[PDB]
Amino acid sequence: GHQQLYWSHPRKFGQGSRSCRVCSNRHGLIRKYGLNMCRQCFRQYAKDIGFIKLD
């Protein structure tokens, strides 16, 4: 009943199957290399990982 009403829409694909690992949002994700996080949290936490500006 309610337990199968809660699980009706599969999450095997689409934008809803992933979100940002910090701010928990579903816009502007980075799926490269397993970051799985949005571009502006990436800008906030870029240089601590090692993403340093040379180019």
Partner 1 sequence: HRIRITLTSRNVKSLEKVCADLIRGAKEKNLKVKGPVRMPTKTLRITTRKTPCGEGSKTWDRFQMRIHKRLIDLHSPSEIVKQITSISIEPGVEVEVTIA
Partner 2 sequence: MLMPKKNRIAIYELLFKEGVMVAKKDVHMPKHPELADKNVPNLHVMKAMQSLKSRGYVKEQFAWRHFYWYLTNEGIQYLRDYLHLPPEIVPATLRR
Partner RNA sequence: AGGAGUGGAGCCUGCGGCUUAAUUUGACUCAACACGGGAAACCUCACCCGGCCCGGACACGGACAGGAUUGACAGAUUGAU
Partner RNA sequence: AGCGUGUGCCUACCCUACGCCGGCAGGCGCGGGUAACCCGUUGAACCCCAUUCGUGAUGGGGAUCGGGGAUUGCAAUUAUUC
CA separation for the pair 24, 18 (Å, rounded): 9
CA separation for the pair 22, 48 (Å, rounded): 14
Does residue 53 interact with partner 1 by CB under 8 A? Answer: yes
Q: Is 38 annotated as a binding residue?
A: yes
**Quick one: what does residue 22 bind among RNA, partner 1, partner 2, none, with the CB cut-off 5 to 8 Å set by partner type?**
partner 2
Q: Is 41 annotated as a binding residue?
A: yes
Of 23, 24, 27, 47, which lies in the binding site for RNA, with binding defined by CB under 7 A?
27
Does residue 5 interact with partner 1 by CB under 8 A? Answer: no
Phi, psi (degrees; rounded to nearest 5) at 38? -75, 165
